[PDB]
A paper describes a structure:
Only RrgB is strictly necessary for the pilus formation while the other two are ancillary proteins.
All the three forms of RrgBD2–D4 possess identical tertiary structure and all exhibited root mean square deviations (rmsds) with each other on aligned carbon alpha atoms of less than 7 Å. The first 262 residues (184–446) form a dual domain (D2 and D3) made of two β-sandwiches of approximately 100 residues present in all crystal forms. The C-terminal 180 residues (446–627) form a third domain (D4) that contains an additional anti-parallel α-helical motif. All three domains D2, D3 and D4 are structurally homologous to each other, consisting of a pair of four-stranded β-sheets forming a β-sandwich configuration. We also find that each of the three crystallized domains of RrgB contains intra-molecular isopeptide bonds involving: Asn 318-Lys193 for D2; Asn 428-Lys349 for D3, and Asn 623-Lys453 for D4.
Residue numbers in the entry: 186 to 627
Write the structure that this text describes.
């Protein structure tokens, strides 16, 4: 029996015979980039499959673009009746009907199926944390109920629990068929985190001490004659798998491409390194003149546009009140009011920054505006690597306005690296931000 072959990659790069070996190197994209993917499957001559299904799911920072799936066989588009497509927020399932199966079965030569589609890197992607998809091709001469893992976060305790059930080909409950081993995998970066095994007398296992902001997946090692149906995620910290006794070959599971966004942290200080609240900046693409970084209007929701306005107004008020205090009056508790308002603002900006463009006039509501908190902190996330320039548009109370822009470089580690000259948060032991120095004489 010749086996089918599969690969998944960016558009034009998939190759089932010779898959890329450096796929674990993420490609830098910015929030709003539409990323195009390609799944190529080779089916041997004289196949007689009862099921040929593809299941694709992705981590939460990639939004599957509904309506973008195209599927061809030997470069001929399938007809609507040839497949059933179901689309969910995190991906899709594409299942050949009998009309579609007829196009890949009983053929006198290898058939090439190509599925293309895109996803948009979204406002939930975290700087330097990659986003990935995961695909299975589930097939066999009997009907197959297998599909691809659904990544999930642990619960707030850092716990993730696997539960397995077993059914026969008809979906009727049956006793555990065999020991079942799974690799717990970091779904963002594709690294194995642990291996667990369920013995036949105990169908649950909990993994502890996981990162609550990381998505993971339990990937079942093939059990002879059983196919793995990963159930829809309903709650953090829980993953469920149903093993169907379909008596089919193990599914195909290609290696997965990765994308990642970059970022930069800053701290507003004076020449004595005192941290300063309420400095406002925009981002330009040159040291003079040039353009300013803005979110694209047609990609910010009504709710998002209003939250930026609301939170900016609360921040302006919180900064004005903090500024009316004497230095001795600027206590931990007073700084906290500013930091809370700034954090709500920063979160609204990150939510509203769904795509970027460069504009001529900095006097534009969509131009990204950064504001320093009472520890002087401000940051930008979701970016392409490159060279950028901060322009101060409003100095901290009592200082002169800066007369030059400040160049900074965004890189694969510009957000996280130490050695940058100041701690983003005082006392952290990591100097992972760049100082922006204000003066009374410019």
């Amino acid at each position: 029996e010749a086996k089918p072959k599969i690969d998944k990659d960016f558009k034009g790069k998939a190759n089932p015979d010779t898959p890329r070996v450096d796929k674990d190197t993420p490609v830098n994209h910015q929030v709003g980039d539409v990323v195009e993917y390609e799944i190529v499957t080779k089916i041997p001559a004289l196949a007689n499959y009862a099921t040929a299904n593809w299941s694709d799911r992705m981590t939460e920072g990639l939004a599957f673009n509904k309506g973008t799936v195209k599927v061809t066989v030997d470069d001929v588009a399938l007809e609507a009746g040839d497949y059933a497509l179901t689309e969910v927020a995190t991906g899709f399932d594409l299942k050949l009907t009998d009309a579609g199966l007829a196009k890949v079965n009983d053929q006198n030569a290898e058939k090439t199926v190509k599925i293309t589609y895109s996803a948009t890197l979204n406002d939930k992607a975290i700087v330097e944390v990659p986003e990935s998809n995961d695909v299975t091709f589930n097939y066999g001469n009997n009907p197959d109920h297998g599909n691809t893992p659904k990544p999930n976060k642990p619960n707030e305790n850092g716990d993730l629990t696997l539960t397995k059930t077993w059914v026969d080909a008809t979906g009727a409950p049956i006793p555990a068929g065999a020991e079942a081993t799974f690799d717990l995998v970091n779904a963002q970066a594709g690294k194995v985190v642990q291996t667990v095994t369920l013995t036949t007398d105990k169908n649950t296992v909990t993994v502890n001490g996981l990162d609550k902001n990381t998505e993971y997946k339990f990937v079942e090692r093939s059990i002879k004659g059983y196919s793995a149906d990963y159930q829809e995620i309903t709650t953090a910290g829980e993953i469920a798998v149903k093993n169907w006794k379909d008596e089919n070959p193990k599914p195909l599971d290609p290696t997965e491409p990765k994308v990642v966004t970059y970022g930069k942290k800053f701290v507003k200080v004076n020449d004595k390194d005192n941290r300063l609240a309420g400095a406002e900046f925009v981002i330009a693409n040159a040291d003079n003149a040039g353009q300013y970084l803005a979110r694209k209007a047609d990609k910010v929701s009504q709710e998002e546009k209003q939250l930026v306005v609301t939170t900016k107004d609360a921040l302006d008020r919180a900064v004005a009140a903090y500024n009316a205090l004497t230095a001795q009056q600027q206590t931990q508790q007073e700084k906290e009011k500013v930091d809370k308002a700034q954090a709500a603002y920063n979160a609204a900006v990150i939510a509203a920054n769904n795509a970027f463009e460069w504009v001529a006039d900095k006097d534009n509501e969509n131009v990204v505006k950064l504001v320093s908190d009472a520890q002087g902190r401000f940051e930008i996330t979701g970016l392409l690597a490159g060279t950028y320039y901060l322009e101060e548009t409003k100095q901290p109370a009592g200082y002169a306005l800066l007369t030059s822009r400040q160049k900074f470089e965004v890189t694969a580690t510009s957000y996280s690296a130490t050695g940058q000259g100041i701690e983003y948060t005082a006392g952290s032991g990591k100097d992972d931000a760049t100082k922006v120095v204000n003066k009374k004489i410019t």
